[model samples]
Target chain A: HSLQDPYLNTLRKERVPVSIYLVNGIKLQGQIESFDQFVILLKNTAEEIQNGEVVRKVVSQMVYKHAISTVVPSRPVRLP
Target chain B: SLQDPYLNTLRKERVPVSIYLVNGIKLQGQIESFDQFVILLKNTAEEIQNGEVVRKVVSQMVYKHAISTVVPSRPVRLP
Candidate 1:
């Protein structure tokens, strides 16, 4: 069997459902029933990394960008 | 001390050799060839880079309320 063939067969056997959601033109993968749960999971994962609880090499770049924006000044607005 | 040229060439070419044990045990050479290994490694690296970009975009969007503003700006300027 091919690389994806086994995965497709597993999904079929387990009846694991999924949905594709567009976030800023990027496609995210997760179960359809637990969309909100996945959002919370992502947020908590990000928060744990930001709080120094998790040290993962893969998400370091994303965490750095989030850290900088948190402490940076917001854009100024002109009078109406 | 003088360096051994034969050992240096073996190291450079990554050639594998077999050795025989007194207990009738024969150590075999490399069974798997090195043809597809490099390509697989390169593809894995590219996928990781793409995933990093996606993660960075997601993190920025979540922290910043405005998605358009959070994205890195292009070179175009308004007239």
Candidate 2:
């Protein structure tokens, strides 16, 4: 079925910044490390520039497919 | 309402923007409508999965479930 869908396959295999839009209204930023038909393993890694100092955070969580709207790739951009 | 200048500024300027969601993701768009709870963004964009790095834009009404902040694209930054 979805095994050949490039959209989900790209996220399943490629290591890139991603945004998972959850049906629960929670948006998550991470790199998708693993996924299957019913679950996704998200590596919650992030970095921010504060006062010219770089700050980073790391964590991981498993998300149910029913709770997701879509998965997306993202680029880090500067804040206003 | 008037106590916090955030929403006021958003309404007063009625400008183009990039907003940070509660979950830490960032998005850019034009705010069409807003209240205390949610906002309607016109011409919004999000990155998607594919061989080609393409960006897609669509209009959406987002609830403040995790909306952390809205920043003007050219506003002054503290850091």
Candidate 3:
């Protein structure tokens, strides 16, 4: 009954940096905070790298599952 | 068998469908086959053949997660 959940679980547990591409071709970078049947919550850190100043804002964005095209991890992880 | 049955019915009946993706792309095809994560759509595409534009039937594997809606060209009765 379970298929892709195991893959998502590892990313969440490891807090891996991931780049999720939407069907609309928008790319979002974040850590997988959580996911359910219909949606995924991403924890994003928006940082302005300018003038050697580090200004960061932590934001959470919820993305619909149907809108997602692919999820690529910054690095590979051991799957369950 | 929650959503599988519906897709299986479409494949068995060879129903022509208009699949609209979340990105506003519309694909016209008949359900060729499907699995846990993807649906293979049998569709026709324009191909360059012998310096001429020809229509060729092709199969595209569409991710279920990338699909927004599937609209049948005609009425369908599901089992």
Candidate 4:
């Protein structure tokens, strides 16, 4: 009967791209790697400096639920 | 786990509360109703004129996901 679980489950299971807006005016582009009651792991494509070189890496970010303002999927999703 | 239980207690007791959103905005109201997605608050707006205060009650709906904290004006017994 809850909308949150179904909405998040669909996005995670279907590999949906997401635009996350945080309360502190930060926008993040990522996929839903994993989530629990209080936190979400966002998978992001990021650049890292390694060995005095630039490396493109995938990073998993831990986002607290309380700090999230909006979770916008790239496309529409079906949920019960 | 304590979400519904806490909200239910607030509503049943008609406690006045201050809801602070993630964006650092504070809203003052009494809990009218709530669900998993949003909360309905009965807000009292004040206007002062000629050394007198006028109050108006308004209803507002706030998304739960956007809220960071809810502070009760007075303490309530948690269920």
Candidate 5:
């Protein structure tokens, strides 16, 4: 139900790992130990988010709550 | 192709709901009290459901993807 919301839907569509797999054709079988490699991967992902090509769902979720407060008015309404 | 009237009705029922921000001026109140706007819209929507004039005013303000850039920020991990 939450995902059905347009805001959430858009966010879900955008966020994704820069690369599907670390190694191109070869399947990585062992543990990845290099910090530099992780940094490169993270950098690519961050670039995508900055470009508005990907949605950072976690961050967006927080923003949603904050945004709601500003958008909704604080007035009493009569219910019929 | 045989067109189903029921399907047509369903399509009509699927009207997309759009909210637009025409100018930075419109965003002024929005930025200051987004939650308030949300409540206002929700109330307006209820009135529309009851066949009120508010719906017409809301539709008039509609524009395509006017607020796309207004989307909230996404979560990111910091190093």
Candidate 6:
């Protein structure tokens, strides 16, 4: 309860899943695996919204903190 | 918006609402006030530690854009 990684600070580096509302008004989902002063490393991300084209290939992504408006956290999804 | 009826219950009754985010974290609480960009939940509980702990009783303001879904708690169904 005293720990404050996921709640605040640098975030839980254990691949914490998150969705971002980018400055360009696009939505993307990924896990926050790493970060720095200017950028946050997103791993195992979904390459969704391919400009409204058919595509597949969920890849890792890197984004600048300036481009992000909000980071919504979700409960870890259970897999089968 | 379909949220109209649901939000009405919030202002009128002690309606509880569950908000889920993209990452999978969940917040359960009673709706107090809301706007297009945000929802104010009174005495909210946030699931932390991988759902192992649910901290309760807080003044939480959640961004609407941050939410993926909202599940109304104990809705009175019309017969």
lDDT of 2: 0.60
Which residues of candidate 1, in runs, are more than 4 Å off? A1-24, A34-48, A55-80, B1-79
Fnat per predicted structure, each in turn: 0.04, 0.00, 0.22, 0.26, 0.14, 0.00
Q: Across residues B1-79, which tens digit of lDDT does each residue of candidate 6 receive? A: 6675567566577677778766566777777666555565666455678658777555443556557888877755422
Each candidate structure's TM-score, on Cα atoms with residue i matched to residue i, is 0.16, 0.41, 0.52, 0.51, 0.17, 0.40
lDDT of 4 by residue, A6-68 (tens): 667788999888877777869888899889878779999878999999999997889887777
DockQ leaderboard ranking: 4, 3, 5, 6, 2, 1
Alpha-carbon shift of residue A41 in model 5 (angstroms): 20
Q: Candidate 2, after superposition: displacement of residue B35 in Å?
A: 36
Model 6 chain A: weakest 10-residue lDDT segment is: A1-10
lDDT of 1 by residue, B1-79 (tens): 1122332333244344332323232332321111110000000111256456322111001222111221111222222
Better of 4 and 6 by lDDT: 4
**Candidate 3, residues A1-80: lDDT per residue as tens digits?**
14456667788999988887678789888898999877789999988866788989898999987777656566655555
Better of 1 and 5 by DockQ: 5
DockQ of 6: 0.05
As a TM-score, model 4 comes out at: 0.51
Q: Which of the predicted structures, 3 or 5, would earn the higher DockQ when compared with the native? A: 3
Tens digits of lDDT, candidate 2, B1-79? 4523655465456668777775566767776555444454655454557765666655444545556667787663221
Each model's Cα RMSD: 25.4, 14.5, 8.6, 10.8, 22.1, 12.7
Question: Candidate 3: where are CA atoms >4 Å away?
Answer: A49-52, B1-35, B38-63, B67-79
Q: Pairs clashing in candidate 4?
A: none
> What value does the interface RMSD of model 3 take?
7.4
Preferred candidate (lDDT higher): 3 or 5: 3
Candidates 1 onward: DockQ, in order = 0.03, 0.03, 0.12, 0.13, 0.06, 0.05
lDDT for predicted candidate 3 compared with the true structure: 0.76
lDDT of 1 by residue, A1-80 (tens): 12123322343344343222232333333221211211211111122465657663322111222121111111111111
Cα deviation at B72, candidate 5, in Å, is: 8.1
